[PDB]
Amino acid sequence: SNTIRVFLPNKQRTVVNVRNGMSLHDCLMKALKVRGLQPECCAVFRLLHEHKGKKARLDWNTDAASLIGEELQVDFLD
């Protein structure tokens, strides 16, 4: 794929495309930028497509191109 979803911590959702020069932070700093959020104070995750009770936690420089074709979330930080 080349698309992934971003669910907000305010329970929202949206779809984003991954380009060259992405990285989680800069790739979500698209998303949240649009939304009016900041990612610096949050933790981003990929959703539990093979887990229960736990989202798959990612890096703020994560290769979203490896989470490509999935659903992501953002939550509180650490």
Swiss-Prot record:
Post-translational modification: This modification leads to destabilization of the protein, possibly through proteasomal degradation.
Location of the RBD domain: 2-77
Tissue-by-tissue expression: In skeletal muscle, isoform 1 is more abundant than isoform 2.
Location(s) in or outside the cell: Cytoplasm; Cell membrane; Mitochondrion; Nucleus
Disorder named in the UniProt entry: Noonan syndrome 5: A form of Noonan syndrome, a disease characterized by short stature, facial dysmorphic features such as hypertelorism, a downward eyeslant and low-set posteriorly rotated ears, and a high incidence of congenital heart defects and hypertrophic cardiomyopathy. Other features can include a short neck with webbing or redundancy of skin, deafness, motor delay, variable intellectual deficits, multiple skeletal defects, cryptorchidism, and bleeding diathesis. LEOPARD syndrome 2: A disorder characterized by lentigines, electrocardiographic conduction abnormalities, ocular hypertelorism, pulmonic stenosis, abnormalities of genitalia, retardation of growth, and sensorineural deafness.
Its job: Serine/threonine-protein kinase that acts as a regulatory link between the membrane-associated Ras GTPases and the MAPK/ERK cascade, and this critical regulatory link functions as a switch determining cell fate decisions including proliferation, differentiation, apoptosis, survival and oncogenic transformation. RAF1 activation initiates a mitogen-activated protein kinase (MAPK) cascade that comprises a sequential phosphorylation of the dual-specific MAPK kinases (MAP2K1/MEK1 and MAP2K2/MEK2) and the extracellular signal-regulated kinases (MAPK3/ERK1 and MAPK1/ERK2).
Similarity comment: Belongs to the protein kinase superfamily. TKL Ser/Thr protein kinase family. RAF subfamily.
Record note on quaternary structure: Monomer. Homodimer. Heterodimerizes with BRAF and this heterodimer possesses a highly increased kinase activity compared to the respective homodimers or monomers. Heterodimerization is mitogen-regulated and enhanced by 14-3-3 proteins. MAPK1/ERK2 activation can induce a negative feedback that promotes the dissociation of the heterodimer. Forms a multiprotein complex with Ras (M-Ras/MRAS), SHOC2 and protein phosphatase 1 (PPP1CA, PPP1CB and PPP1CC). Interacts with LZTR1. Interacts with Ras proteins; the interaction is antagonized by RIN1. Weakly interacts with RIT1.
Protein name: RAF proto-oncogene serine/threonine-protein kinase
Residues of the full protein shown: 55 to 132 of 648
